[PDB]
Amino acid sequence: AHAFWSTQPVPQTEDETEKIVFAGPMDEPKTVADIPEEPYPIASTFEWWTPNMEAADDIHAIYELLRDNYVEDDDSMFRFNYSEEFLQWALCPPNYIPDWHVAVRRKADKKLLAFIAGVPVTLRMGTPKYMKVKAQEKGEGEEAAKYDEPRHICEINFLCVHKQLREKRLAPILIKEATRRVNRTNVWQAVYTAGVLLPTPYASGQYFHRSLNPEKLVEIRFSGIPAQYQKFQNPMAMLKRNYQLPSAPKNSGLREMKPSDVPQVRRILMNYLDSFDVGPVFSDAEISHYLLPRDGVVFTYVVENDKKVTDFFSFYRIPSTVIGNSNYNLLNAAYVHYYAATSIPLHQLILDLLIVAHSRGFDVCNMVEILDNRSFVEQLKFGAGDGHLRYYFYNWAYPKIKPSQVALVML
Numbered sequence: 001a002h003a004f005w006s007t008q009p010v011p012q013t014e015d016e017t018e019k020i021v022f023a024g025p026m027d028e029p030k031t032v033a034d035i036p037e038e039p040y041p042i043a044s045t046f047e048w049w050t051p052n053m054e055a056a057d058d059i060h061a062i063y064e065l066l067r068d069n070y071v072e073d074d075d076s077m078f079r080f081n082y083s084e085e086f087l088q089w090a091l092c093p094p095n096y097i098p099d100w101h102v103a104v105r106r107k108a109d110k111k112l113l114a115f116i117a118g119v120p121v122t123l124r125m126g127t128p129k130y131m132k133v134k135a136q137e138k139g140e141g142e143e144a145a146k147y148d149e150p151r152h153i154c155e156i157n158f159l160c161v162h163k164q165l166r167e168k169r170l171a172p173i174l175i176k177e178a179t180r181r182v183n184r185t186n187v188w189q190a191v192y193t194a195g196v197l198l199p200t201p202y203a204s205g206q207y208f209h210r211s212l213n214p215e216k217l218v219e220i221r222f223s224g225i226p227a228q229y230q231k232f233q234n235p236m237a238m239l240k241r242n243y244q245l246p247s248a249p250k251n252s253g254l255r256e257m258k259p260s261d262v263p264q265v266r267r268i269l270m271n272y273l274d275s276f277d278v279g280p281v282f283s284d285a286e287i288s289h290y291l292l293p294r295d296g297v298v299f300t301y302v303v304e305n306d307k308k309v310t311d312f313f314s315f316y317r318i319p320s321t322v323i324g325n326s327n328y329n330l331l332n333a334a335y336v337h338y339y340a341a342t343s344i345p346l347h348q349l350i351l352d353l354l355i356v357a358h359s360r361g362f363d364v365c366n367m368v369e370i371l372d373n374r375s376f377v378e379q380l381k382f383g384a385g386d387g388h389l390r391y392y393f394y395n396w397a398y399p400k401i402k403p404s405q406v407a408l409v410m411l
């Protein structure tokens with residue numbers, strides 16, 4: 001069934017995943033000295049390449065590979081078109097390791113044929129609360145809490161093989177070479193997400209989308225006057241009416257985040273993230289990097305009253321190519337990123353996200369049902385999508401958890 005994945009330290013079936021009681025490594029412990037020092041062998045016509053993520057030309061190359069060959073939805077209606085500025089932001093967070101960015105190029109002409117990227121993340125990934133309960137009833141609290149300390153691991157994203165090289169087993173070679181480069185730095189776990197089902201997710205959630213420009217969503221038959229709008233006299237006026245938003249935020253105290261807000265945002269986010277079973281831990285430098293506004297990339301607002309930040313939200317932008325549509329070639333989507341509410345209902349905070357996003361020209365707001373995202377779906381008129389996002393670890397046994405116990409947003 002899986003000539004590659006059966007060779008790897010991941011849970012091999014749902015059954016296995018249902019038996020797992022404690023968090024911990026799957027593989028034999030290893031040391032850096034046991035890992036090969038030489039890159040994995042590859043065909044003599046290809047060569048490994050470590051792009052320089054501060055070289056414009058190198059980020060452009062990666063940009064073009066992904067524009068034309070990265071992920072499409074199962075109906076090939078969309079392909080992501082991550083921008084060069086977004087790639088620089090996602091690939092170069094504080095303390096990133098340039099060697100974790102792995103590419104294959106054709107030797108002859110230096111054509112980029114494949115890519116995978118790893119970045120550091122500090123993750124809480126100890127045993128979940130409801131497994132730790134069952135572990136007091138067993139006498140077993142010490143083994144259940146053994147890996148509670150946040151761990152410095154790798155987050156994998158942007159795996160891409162050029163369409164002309166598909167189904168030639170190049171993706172396993174990429175994964176093996178990234179694993180080697182991460183293990184050479186004494187890191188032995190990774191976290192990653194995918195739309196597809198692989199062996200074997202520890203959590204899975206549906207996507208949700210909120211229409212902000214229903215006219216456009218129609219012209220690119222994603223909405224297409226959704227079937228339920230037919231019996232209306234006037235399907236489009238009703239559609240716009242339903243999804244209309246205010247012009248300006250409703251919360252007194254909302255403004256863009258600025259650098260002097262970083263400590264307060266760190267505190268309120270870390271307090272909120274703590275409640276979930278799997279979630280990141282951010283330094284002030286990581287909060288600065290992932291939440292300070294960057295044009296075209298990430299947008300973050302705080303509610304400040306009486307000079308205290310009490311709430312905030314963020315969203316980031318990923319445009320998609322609209323496949324087979326030259327009238328409307330691009331979808332401008334906003335994705336809910338981290339947030340924390342202490343003074344207002346979450347629905348009132350995220351209503352202001354939608355207002356801001358609409359004001360700034362976004363066509364749709366998307367999210368996975370992680371964090372407390374289900375608490376505002378109905379009131380804010382999100383609809384469940386096609387598609388899911390599945391969360392995975394490499395070399396980490398972990399019980400199945402609901403997506404509302406996951407606090408890691410994956411770009």
Ligand SMILES: CCCCCCCCCCCCCC(=O)SCCNC(=O)CCNC(=O)[C@H](O)C(C)(C)COP(=O)(O)OP(=O)(O)OC[C@H]1O[C@@H](n2cnc3c(N)ncnc32)[C@H](O)[C@@H]1OP(=O)(O)O
Nearest residue numbers: 002003004005071158159160161166167168169170171188
């Ligand atoms: C400690 C550090 C560890 C670091 C590493 C942690 C692991 C990270 C793992 C990577 C996390 C990535 C997170 C993201 O970026 S998810 C986004 C993935 N990217 C895309 O979907 C872009 C469009 N598609 C492609 O570029 C290609 O179709 C890819 C590259 C996906 C497969 O290329 P191709 O179609 O040319 O096939 P092949 O003949 O070379 O290889 C076939 C083998 O590949 C397995 N496959 C297929 N899809 C995926 C998938 N999304 N993740 C993991 N494996 C996948 C498949 O089961 C099969 O194995 P097996 O079934 O035969 O056993």
Ligand SMILES: CCOC(=O)c1cnc2ccc(OCc3ccc(N4CCNCC4)nc3)cc2c1SCCC#N
Nearest residue numbers: 071072073078079080193195207208209320366385411
């Ligand atoms: C109009 C509402 O739909 C969208 O806005 C949209 C746009 N571009 C895409 C591009 C590709 C795509 O493929 C499915 C997919 C595949 C992978 C993935 N990952 C991979 C790893 N990193 C996080 C996201 N997320 C989604 C779905 C999409 C979708 S559906 C998923 C987002 C939502 N809702």
Ligand SMILES: [Mg+2]
Nearest residue numbers: 167168169170
């Ligand atoms: Mg291949």
